[PDB]
Design an enzyme around this catalytic site. Structure first.
Site, PDB file in Angstrom:
ATOM      1  N   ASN A  10       0.947  -0.935  -0.227  1.00 13.26           N
ATOM      2  CA  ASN A  10      -0.077   0.005  -0.069  1.00 13.26           C
ATOM      3  C   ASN A  10       0.640   1.252   0.394  1.00 13.26           C
ATOM      4  O   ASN A  10       2.143   1.065  -0.205  1.00 13.26           O
ATOM      5  CB  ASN A  10      -0.976   0.263   0.838  1.00 13.26           C
ATOM      6  CG  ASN A  10      -0.086   0.612   2.374  1.00 13.26           C
ATOM      7  OD1 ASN A  10       0.412  -0.209   2.950  1.00 13.26           O
ATOM      8  ND2 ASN A  10      -1.195   1.553   3.137  1.00 13.26           N
ATOM      9  N   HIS A  42       5.572   6.237  -6.992  1.00 13.39           N
ATOM     10  CA  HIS A  42       6.061   5.362  -6.929  1.00 13.39           C
ATOM     11  C   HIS A  42       7.432   4.740  -6.124  1.00 13.39           C
ATOM     12  O   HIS A  42       8.832   5.188  -7.260  1.00 13.39           O
ATOM     13  CB  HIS A  42       5.394   3.265  -7.710  1.00 13.39           C
ATOM     14  CG  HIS A  42       4.485   3.145  -8.486  1.00 13.39           C
ATOM     15  ND1 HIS A  42       3.050   2.309  -7.646  1.00 13.39           N
ATOM     16  CD2 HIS A  42       4.004   3.639  -9.096  1.00 13.39           C
ATOM     17  CE1 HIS A  42       2.505   2.656  -7.673  1.00 13.39           C
ATOM     18  NE2 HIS A  42       2.013   4.086  -9.056  1.00 13.39           N
TER      19      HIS A  42
END
Length: 196
Positions: free
Chosen positions: A30, A41
């Site tokens: 998560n 990311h």
DNA sequence: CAGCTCTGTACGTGAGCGATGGACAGCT
DNA sequence: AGCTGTCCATCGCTCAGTACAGAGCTG
């Protein structure tokens, strides 16, 4: 975070980066707070992902989180997470949140059908396996798993989390072996497809 | 018993915070 | 020479899943 509160960051999410015809989809757990803050990311100063990607030769140069949207087209790699909600950590999530995520993940994988679904973390594969394959082994190992995502040819491959929280793999160097074998798997699969 | 599953304890690096204080130059 | 502030090197420090023992469960 440069004047942005945690409470603000808790409500942000991190977009998936997914296309058809990928070699690899990296599945994190998560978003952490820095990911939520950046909207990219693995931005964590200490996270090993981008280091490992280069050290393994999955990228031929050192990239960073700002490059993430280039990975599908250029590198054959995309990104999602098991759970969408941002939390200050991976033990803040409930089992239900995890199972909901697993269901959503498997539908995404059935849609995009990458060659290899890469679980960036043993813990999320443990959950996934139970939920999707109805299998819990007592000795889950890293690397290639023996079940394809249902109704697809997409393999499952597990690595130690790129988070620098785990002591058993204390450095990027200690995880690179898995990224190298991931590269080898991809290359093998492409070789089979090429040679029929 | 013997396998589970479920819970809580314990663990290594390195990046980058605020705090500290040493080097140094400007000014008198 | 004496004083002062900035810059910056450096410190101690924090902190970003996994493995496993043991308790509990159940066949």
């Amino acid at each position: 975070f440069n004047g942005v509160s945690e409470a603000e960051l808790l409500t942000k999410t991190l977009p998936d980066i997914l296309t058809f015809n990928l070699d690899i989809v990296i599945i994190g757990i998560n978003p952490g707070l820095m990911a939520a803050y950046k909207g990219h990311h693995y931005p964590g100063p200490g996270n090993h992902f981008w280091k490992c990607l280069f050290m393994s030769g999955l990228s031929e140069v050192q990239l960073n989180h700002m490059d993430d949207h280039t990975l599908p087209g250029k590198y054959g790699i995309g990104f999602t997470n098991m759970v969408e909600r941002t939390t200050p950590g991976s033990k803040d999530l409930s089992s239900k949140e995890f199972r909901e995520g697993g269901r959503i993940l498997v539908q995404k994988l059935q849609k995009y059908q990458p060659r290899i679904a890469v679980f960036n973390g043993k813990c999320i594969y443990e959950i996934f396996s139970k939920e999707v394959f109805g299998v819990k082994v007592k000795n889950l190992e890293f690397g290639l798993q023996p079940h394809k995502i249902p109704d697809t040819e997409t393999l499952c491959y597990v690595m130690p989390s790129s988070s620098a929280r785990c002591a058993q793999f204390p450095r990027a160097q200690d995880k690179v072996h898995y990224y190298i074998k991931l590269k080898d798997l991809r290359d093998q699969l492409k070789g089979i497809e090429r040679n029929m």
